[PDB]
Structures are given as C-alpha cells and as structure tokens.
Swiss-Prot record, chains A, B:
Note: Antibodies against PNMA2 are present in sera from patients suffering of paraneoplastic neurological disorders.
Free-text tissue specificity from the UniProt record: Brain-specific. In some cancer patients, specifically expressed by testicular tumor cells.
This protein's encoding gene: PNMA2
Included stretch of the parent chain: 158 to 340 of 364
Compartmental location: Nucleus, Nucleolus
Name listed for the protein in its UniProt record: Paraneoplastic antigen Ma2
Organism: Homo sapiens
Family: Belongs to the PNMA family.
GO cellular component terms, A-Z: nucleolus
Keywords in alphabetical order: Acetylation, Nucleus, Tumor antigen
Presence of keyword Nucleus: yes
Gene Ontology BP, a term: positive regulation of apoptotic process
C-alpha cells in the first residue's frame, strides 16, 4: 500500500531562506500542479495554495486579491511570478557558466554534475546554440577540472575519437577512473 | 612629387620583440605583397624577403630551402606560417573578449577603439555570430566602462531607440560627452 502522505514543498521569498525551502522554480511546479490538475473547489485550491507560502511571499497574496475581486488562480500566479521570479541577461547566463571551476576537495564526478545544471540555463536563454552543447561541455571540463594524468589520457581520446560524448557516457568514463585500491 | 621611399616593416619572431617591430599578421601583409604583386626576378624577391627578417625568424629560412631545392616563394611562406603564426581555440577568443575592462586614466573613446579589435577576431573564429555583433558591442561597453551619469542617460536611449548603433555612430555620441569647459 502507498505510504504516508507527503508534505508540501515551501517558499519564503526572503533574501536568505531557511535550508528546508525550495527554489522558486520548484515551488512553482507544485503550484502549477495544484492549479491545473487537482479535482478541487476554488476556495479549497486557494487554501492549499496559501498554506504553502511563508516569509514575505505570504504577504503579497492578500494585497493582489483586494484590488481585483474577479481574479482567478491562473491570473493570481501571473502577479506572483513578476515579484518573486527571475530576470537574467543573455550575457550573464554565458559569463556565469564559463567562470565555473572545481572546488577544494570536490570530486570530478561531483563537479561534472554541478556544471550540467548551468549548461541547460545557458541553452534555454539562447546564449549557447543547442547544436554545439556536447562540444562546449568537454572543452569546459578540460578547462576547469584538476584531472590526474591517466584520466587525461582517456579524455584526450574522447576529444579525437569521432563525435563528442553525451552526459551519461562522459560520466561513466570519469567514474571508472575515480576508484582507489586499499592498503 | 612622391616623397622619400618607405622603409620595410620588420619582424624578429622573438618572445619579446623590439618596440619597432610589427605583429606577424602585418609583416605577412608586406610579404604577401612582395610575393603576389612586385614585378621582380625570383632571387631579387628572395633577397627583399630575406632583408626584412631578424631574430630567430631569419634563421629558419635557410634550413627549409636546403632540404628542398624546388621550393617556390609561395611554398616557403607556408612553412613560415606554421612555425611563427597563431593558434587559438574558439573558447579562448570568446573568453579573451568578454574579460576586457577600462584601465586607470584611460578615456572612454580610447577604450571603445581598443575593444573593437577584439570583437573582429571573435567573429572571424565563429565564436560570436555576425548577426548580433552590434548588440554584443553595446552590452560590453555598459558592462566595462566607467560612464558618467550624463553619458549614462544617452547610452540608455540608444539601447531602446530602435536598432543598436554602428561603430562610428557610438563613437560620435561618446566624443560629444568627453569634452570639458575651462576655468
């Protein structure tokens, strides 16, 4: 049998959130689900929507409704996106990707996962053409990582051995090299 | 009457040249002229070509000829390009442009000229699409320059007033703002 009901994800909109809160992009997934999918009455949608909000973000929702009583939940979410959503230039998406380097004590397979989230944003905002993202991924790994020289021998084969690797192919080759023998 | 004959441009190939020498890209203009245009005999071409070389660069020319006596001047310049020419990735052209900021005591019209040489290299090497170079120029000037706020008011009109400006249009608007009144 399906286990315990799952708690709502949550969001404050604060300049420094609590470590249990989500990104706006993820709270907006839960909110889009509640709006589009749930078989529920409007005031019960609105009480489930309201129950997820904290911080400053809870405080906007009342102001917007009082000034327009005809507001649907589909319209109220459009006001919520303007105040708490995100604005970022093409140049900022591009510069924020290319500046990313491996940290102290971070593993190479941890770095290559962290770096892949930034490459998707830069391809959405048309900063990088989708035609060349697999070449741009390999060039940035060899630029930013602290590769051991047996790993260096393999990545230099992938650079030359036909087309550039996919994400899961590159991630496999890295994992085979990360393992150490005990003493 | 046309004035005194003009001295040959010159090139050493050294890791630090004398301040009178040119870039390889400019010595190669003079060499391409001598090869393609001058109405001269081969050994006299080769003595004019040789007379322009110094440093290490003078020393290669003999080695290459001894190993292949059939070598034309058109073929000998192809060997010269391999040893002294330039190699640069797409990613290095892009990163070397976007990192460029105004210096201590440099004027804004001096900065916008210095920055335009780097934008041409990045469009040759296909790092930046030629379709968008006029937008990319204005975004980098507002990022890198130390604009006074009356200049800031005008560049923010150009950003919104239809298409982005050309090089000489932007250079005119900057020059009108740089001038000061005496006391």
């Amino acid at each position: 049998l399906p286990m315990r009901y799952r708690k709502l994800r949550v969001f404050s909109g604060s300049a420094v959130p609590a470590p249990e809160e989500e990104s706006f992009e993820v709270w907006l997934e839960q909110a889009t689900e509640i709006v589009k999918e749930w078989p529920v009455t409007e005031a019960e949608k609105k009480r489930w929507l309201a129950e997820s909000l904290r911080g400053p973000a809870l405080d906007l929702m009342h102001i917007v409704q009082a000034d327009n009583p005809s507001i649907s939940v589909e319209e109220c979410l459009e006001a919520f996106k303007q105040v708490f959503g995100s604005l970022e230039s093409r140049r900022t998406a591009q510069v924020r990707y290319l500046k990313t380097y491996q940290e102290e004590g971070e593993k190479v397979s941890a770095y290559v996962l962290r770096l892949e989230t930034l490459l998707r944003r830069a391809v959405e905002k048309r900063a990088i053409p989708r035609r060349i993202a697999d070449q741009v991924r390999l060039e940035q790994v060899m630029a930013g990582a602290t590769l051991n020289q047996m790993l260096w021998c393999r990545l230099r084969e992938l650079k030359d051995q036909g087309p550039p690797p996919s994400f899961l192919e590159l991630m496999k080759v890295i994992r085979e090299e990360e393992e150490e023998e005990a003493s």
